[PDB]
Symmetry: C5
Subunit: 206 residues, 5 copies
């Protein structure tokens, strides 16, 4: 019931102890999902980092969004990874939405409201329910074994997660800032635990 | 009567077994034609691919639209090919309209509503009626004999065909999204058969 | 009285036998003139071509507009030539308006409604009335001796001619598309003769 | 009482004598602060310079804003420095806002109304009250020991200072030109002393 | 009282005989001045030229505005010169406004309504009243000893002069074609003498 509207988490130092852990209530296994977030960092030209870590007991990298230096975005599900290449790197806040479906196997990536081509990953796969969701590091185990080089220095916010694939119209609505009701992770009724040096401050982006 | 408005075909893998075959009812030979379609792919900098294949018993490549690496668009009628060069490649959905007339031999190409210079090809020629129209591969014979390296990975839609040449005003109307009534292939009353791994999903372009 | 509004001449092949000859009624010698036209061609990066050819018995090149490869526009009157250099070549329809005055010698050139610096050429010279006006090839005699390398492939239209110099306001009016009444060549009351492979088709530019 | 709206200070020559010294009334030690100013100079591609100098008896560089050639902006507090790199240099007036908070240690930088990533500097530190605030040179003692190479030649104005951090909405209001009431330095109620060749003239920027 | 609104002087050839001399009525020495003018030439990439020449018996270069190849604008007063460097060269009409004041020595330069940094030159200096103002060449004596290499080929107009410095608001008004009343040189009440080949034609710029 902690409303984090018009607020963002700030990691101002490079460390291996600062992070935030989010909690989801569901227990039914996931067959399709959508994740949307807003982030701002200046490490693109210096090294790679992690934007969203979702780990289960069996697999550490179950749903992970990564930035790889000189290559671009890396979306990994169930241990298998696809690359979305960006040639030019910009300095400004970035809004990313991602969606994955099981029966079809299609993966959709939206960067700042503009879609990328559709790819394929892990057809006929089930994502576990009991899991740890971490912002700040890229978990090599179940909520532990963090890596300093894979940390994030900057601001993160507007983290929402659904349990079904969103249509383009709803993605445009989210980008513009209309109303919506996520059913996995809600930015207006969020449960979280903060460990280390993490701060909560007004968001820079509009 | 399968209305396909606001929907598109998705090919998410490189294969030689996935395609869609469309059907047309007419039997009178064709002396002039127009084809308009929308597509999105990320293979421009990697290899060439087919966008529209039209095959008859005598000729495999009767009306074919192709992309040639480092060169640009290739329009082939009756086995004779002409080239429309594009030096700059952009990553975004593309709308193409093409028209051919027999008495004059003029060929008209419109990319995103902006026309290209008119060229000449295959004057005094008749295009057969009984034919196979395939999206997904470039048929080297009648339906079949598919080329693995000439497949299309990505999204395709808004395929419309007329049996007469269109004036610039009508092409502008098509680009902006007004009403029209094609008489060979209609995206509101389409007959089609899908083979392989081809999906039907909401369109990404507006 | 053949109204040629919303229409254009198309030369789709490179040849030395296709041209269009226009007729003018006046007989009083010329001491100042203005010529306005629209054209579209993709030969800028390959070779040169002639846009407007005007020839008399004494001089084959009385008023000629040319494009010289890697240099730019070339305006020649009475056999003497001046150059307007453009470093960047664009692919789109081009509207050019030129004007010359005798008592002063100033030559004005307008490309896409934006003027170029004023230059001097052939002061105190009279241009003959009995002449042949040709689009398609540059003339080396009185309506003959065409050169293949100097031909035009593409579209031409909106050819108008006045026997006096126009003010900038009227040039802007012409470019935008207002009304005017030329007194030498009128695109609404044109007399013409077509020889070879020349087609009359709806224009591409607005 | 000396309202300085629509006015600016001009240093037109490079010297080590010209400067302006401003006065602040408060005596309570500072735990957070914000500084906003507008400046215009053409020395970016030649050498460095100081935009805002704030010195105390213990340290000469307590709050100093600097420009370093080929690097960019340098914000130094308590003797510790952090860099904000700009690769592209432009010729136009620049508006800069900076903010520092002690409990968090976060430093915020805004250039032309667009925020930079948040960084960390000097957590748990107190800034003295009795201080000398100088525009024109970068002090190396308490109001003395100026350096010619570090002087500023150009225009400076719209200097305002608060003793608390500002929200992004208030920063946008300041940039647009709305009303506000600073409580340390007020451009409408300034106390100042001008020494050397410094002039007061209408501001160039809107 | 020869109103010259919507008219401009044209020099279409390079020579050392064509020029226009303007007359001013005042006899009180000058302590501050402002000069505004519009010009169009294509010689920037070829050589230098003079835009405004102001000469007296003692000094030939009293108020001279010049263009130096590969460097940019050169403003010279009383024989001492300062440079305003432009790295990029454009092809379009240019509007320049320059201002000088004696008590402070500040020199102000406005190109196309955008200010440049303020610089210092000739503090405590008086400009003579009895003088020759020439457009067309850069006088090396009292209205004589012209130089061909330093001539201007192109168009000039909207020449106005004030005997006091102008605030930025009035400069913006001038750039937008508002009303004003100069008291040294008035483009609506000009006294001029034309010698050589100089023409009066409608202005190209709006
Ligand atoms: C434990 C293991 O972690 C993942 O591997 C990640 C790898 O990082 C290594 C650690 O995982 C850890 O094993 C060790 O590496 C040792 C390794 O354990 C040992 O067997 C071998 O002999 O020596 C290695 C030392 O180099 O320390 C680091 C190097 O990094 C690679 C990078 O490709 C993997 O991809 C994993 O990195 P990641 O967690 O950050 O995720 C990737 C980042 O892009 C995905 O994009 C494994 O994947 C398993 O989860 C687990 O078994
Ligand atoms: C004269 C032209 O010949 C063909 O040109 C195509 C050729 O592709 C080869 C064809 O031979 C194709 O049938 C296939 O043949 C295989 C196939 O298994 C079967 O025929 C035989 O048993 O084994 C053959 C082993 O190769 O092999 C391919 C490589 O090559 C040209 C260019 O070199 C074109 O690629 C043609 O194929 P395309 O469909 O892609 O043509 C497009 C036209 O623009 C490409 O732009 C044609 O098939 C016709 O026979 C004839 O026109
Ligand atoms: C008309 C006469 O010559 C013009 O020169 C043009 C020349 O074209 C050739 C002409 O000379 C033409 O008579 C013929 O040549 C004759 C001639 O007897 C002789 O050359 C030889 O015997 O062969 C022919 C038969 O006897 O062939 C043509 C090709 O080409 C030059 C090349 O620069 C000129 O440029 C003229 O051609 P152009 O129209 O294309 O000029 C363009 C202007 O930009 C080129 O850019 C000249 O105009 C003479 O002044 C004129 O008297
Ligand atoms: C306390 C000392 O001074 C500041 O650091 C500046 C230093 O530059 C020197 C200045 O300190 C200045 O007084 C003088 O130095 C004296 C001093 O006695 C001693 O350092 C030297 O041996 O003799 C000099 C004459 O007595 O000369 C300058 C060079 O070190 C750096 C080097 O550039 C900077 O100059 C420091 O500050 P700055 O104002 O000069 O330049 C800015 C600093 O960021 C530009 O970024 C600080 O107080 C430090 O505590 C310490 O260095
Ligand atoms: C007297 C001199 O006049 C102007 O000088 C410009 C100079 O032009 C030369 C003149 O100096 C003129 O006397 C003569 O030069 C003499 C002189 O003895 C010497 O140059 C040479 O050895 O012998 C010549 C004949 O005996 O010839 C002309 C060309 O040239 C310089 C260098 O370019 C500048 O151009 C001088 O000023 P400017 O009018 O050309 O404008 C320049 C544009 O930037 C200045 O910025 C000037 O009025 C001098 O002040 C004055 O002393
Ligand atoms: Ca991991
Ligand atoms: Ca790891
Ligand atoms: Ca084929
Ligand atoms: Ca093939
Ligand atoms: Ca000729
Ligand atoms: Ca010729
Ligand atoms: Ca110091
Ligand atoms: Ca110093
Ligand atoms: Ca001189
Ligand atoms: Ca000279």
């Amino acid at each position: 019931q902690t409303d984090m509207s018009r607020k963002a988490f700030v990691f101002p130092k490079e460390s291996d102890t600062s992070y935030v852990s989010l909690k989801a209530p569901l227990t039914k296994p996931l067959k399709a999902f959508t994740v949307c977030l807003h982030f701002y960092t200046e490490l693109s030209s210096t090294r790679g980092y992690s934007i969203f870590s979702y780990a289960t007991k069996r697999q550490d990298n179950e749903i992970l969004i990564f930035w790889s230096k000189d290559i671009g975005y890396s979306f990994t599900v169930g241990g298998s990874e696809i690359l979305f290449e960006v040639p030019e790197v910009t300095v400004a806040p970035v809004h990313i939405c991602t969606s994955w479906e099981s029966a079809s196997g299609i993966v959709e990536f939206w960067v700042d409201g503009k879609p990328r081509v559709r790819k394929s990953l892990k057809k006929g796969y089930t994502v576990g329910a009991e899991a740890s969701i971490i912002l700040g590091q890229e978990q090599d185990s179940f909520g532990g074994n963090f890596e300093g080089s894979q940390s994030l220095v900057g601001d993160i916010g507007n983290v929402n997660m659904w349990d079904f694939v969103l249509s383009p119209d709803e993605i445009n609505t989210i980008y513009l800032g209309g109303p919506f009701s996520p059913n996995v992770l809600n930015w207006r009724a969020l449960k979280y635990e903060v460990q280390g040096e993490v701060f909560t401050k007004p968001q820079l982006w509009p």
